[PDB]
Design a protein around this ligand. Structure first.
Ligand SMILES: Cc1cc2nc3c(=O)[nH]c(=O)nc-3n(C[C@H](O)[C@H](O)[C@H](O)COP(=O)(O)OP(=O)(O)OC[C@H]3O[C@@H](n4cnc5c(N)ncnc54)[C@H](O)[C@@H]3O)c2cc1C
Ligand SMILES: [Cl-]
Length: 487
């Protein structure tokens, strides 16, 4: 008989799941499995993103139970767990979504070898991305494109991505009864308290495929807003209703299919001939995701500077003091400190908000390495994506893809153009709620009588600016200029 395992790593969904569809075909028993490492916190990861994963698994558990099945959260390492469940469950086929991250290829290759030793067939369909990334590289002559312009001409030469896969059947072959490794006491979804966390998550974005599909429909309630979407014109100070979709944590964990997103976009574009085009359109935003995935998966040492062929070697400063202030949101610039508070609270910020803090830390003011800023984002972001977090950090530091190091965001002026009253700042920095709008971006410039009135004294209740932007930016620009001439 056919007993199959559908291995969940990314792609935490039932829609557009070709790996799940293959595992259910002519199957007597199907074992949905997520392999959890109970020693992950005893190695880095916030409770916000880890609880987002756990919520995403609870949603899978409910979806499987509605179809007569059950999600199994096995404990341990994959190389030590699968060889046992292969013989115990009588497995003949192992299916999982293909993943191109560096750690995935080593993990998957070892699992492939273990499956071959147990006589288990392996099926690895591509569904986390729009296209077969290796196919894009081969069609381009063996090398990936290094610009969005040329990459967009490539995907237009290949055509539309594959349509989303159909939905799985309403009834699924369940796991076999009375199997010791499938016992409910050892395979349930744990809570964030049981995995070692001590403080509760504070984010407002819930995990799971059902929430992903709900937020997708919410984005498509107005087709005119979808067709006329232009990324650089959106508002980074909007928090009550974010100016963008906030689908990135669902796309990172696979809770929402990218091909489904792209299929829904084409349906709206077909009825609106004046829709925006890449790179600024919503379709272009998934193409940015596809572009960084293609270049990152084929570039050695893509998450670092040394040994990275596309990253410029800049002599960034080893300044732990500036890094600490930036990390702990006490730089003295309320626009920067509020975004860093939104990072640790929600775990998500608007794209232009991430530009402000990443430019400030690197080529703009502090001259700290983008690697150090990356390690801060990898901890707190709930959409933390390997290839995307680096390519955008290398973009903001002018180490790759981007090279206009004379464009330096002002930490005082940038947020003033969108939000003159500073409503975004009072929400996340309530110490400044009563500060008048004239000084909310420059609190150190307010008279002492005003600071005492507003209950916010600079140097006592809120810190002073760590640097003078006029002095710091002119110095970083000169250093980046000499680094570009020596390269
Ligand atoms: C320093 C820095 C770090 C970043 N790190 C991440 C990260 O770890 N994970 C992440 O998903 N994005 C990252 N981005 C891109 C950007 O922060 C988010 O993709 C976006 O702000 C999420 O909002 P949204 O889902 O509403 O995006 P939308 O505007 O709705 O875009 C739709 C989708 O396209 C993708 N996308 C959008 N912008 C980009 C981009 N610039 N590059 C690649 N894909 C993009 C995402 O999957 C997103 O969900 C980073 C950007 C910067 C400047
Ligand atoms: Cl500016």
């Amino acid at each position: 008989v056919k007993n199959s395992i559908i291995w969940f790593r990314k792609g935490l969904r039932l829609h557009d799941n070709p790996a799940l569809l293959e595992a259910c075909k002519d199957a007597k028993h199907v074992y949905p499995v997520f392999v959890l490492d109970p020693h992950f916190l005893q190695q880095k990861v916030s409770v916000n993103r880890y609880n987002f994963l756990l919520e995403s698994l609870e949603d899978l558990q409910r979806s499987f139970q509605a179809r007569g099945s059950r999600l199994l959260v096995l404990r341990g390492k994959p190389e030590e767990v699968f060889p046992r469940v292969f013989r115990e469950w009588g497995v003949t086929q192992l299916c999982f979504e293909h993943d191109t991250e560096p750690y995935a290829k080593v993990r998957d290759a070892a699992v492939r070898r273990l499956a071959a030793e147990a006589g288990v067939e392996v099926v690895t369909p591509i569904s986390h991305t729009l296209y077969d990334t290796d196919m894009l590289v081969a069609r381009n002559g063996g090398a990936a494109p290094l610009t969005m312009q040329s990459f967009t001409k490539l995907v237009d030469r290949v055509g539309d991505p594959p349509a989303p896969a159909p939905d799985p059947p309403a009834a699924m072959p369940p796991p076999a009864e009375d199997m010791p490794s499938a016992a409910p006491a050892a395979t349930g979804v744990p809570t964030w308290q049981e995995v070692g966390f001590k403080e509760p998550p504070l984010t407002v974005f819930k995990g799971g495929e059902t929430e992903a599909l709900a937020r997708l429909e919410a984005a498509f309630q107005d087709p005119k807003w979808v067709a006329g979407f232009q990324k650089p014109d959106t508002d980074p100070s909007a928090w009550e209703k974010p100016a963008t979709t906030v689908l990135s944590p669902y796309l990172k964990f696979g809770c929402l299919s990218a091909r489904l997103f792209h299929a829904r976009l084409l349906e709206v574009y077909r009825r609106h001939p004046a829709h925006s085009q890449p790179p600024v359109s919503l379709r272009g935003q998934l193409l940015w995701r596809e572009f960084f995935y293609t270049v990152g998966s084929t570039t050695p040492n893509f998450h670092r500077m040394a040994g990275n062929p596309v990253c410029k070697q800049i002599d960034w400063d080893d300044n732990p003091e500036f890094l600490a202030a930036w990390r702990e949101a006490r730089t003295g610039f309320p626009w920067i400190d509020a975004i860093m508070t939104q990072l640790v609270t929600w775990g998500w910020m608007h794209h232009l908000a991430r530009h402000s803090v990443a430019c400030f830390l690197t080529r703009g003011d502090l001259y700290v390495s983008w690697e150090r800023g990356m390690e801060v984002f990898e901890e707190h972001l709930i959409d933390q994506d390997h290839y995307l977090n680096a390519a955008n950090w290398m973009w903001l530091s002018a180490s790759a893809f981007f090279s206009q190091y004379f464009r330096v965001y002002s930490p005082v002026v940038f947020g003033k153009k969108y939000d003159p009253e500073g409503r975004f700042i009072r929400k996340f920095l309530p110490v400044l709620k009563d500060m008048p709008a004239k000084y909310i971006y420059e609190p150190w410039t307010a008279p002492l009588e005003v600071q005492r009135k507003a209950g916010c004294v600079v140097g006592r209740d809120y810190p002073a600016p760590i640097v003078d932007h006029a002095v710091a930016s002119k110095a970083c620009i000169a250093r980046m200029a000499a680094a570009y001439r020596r390269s």
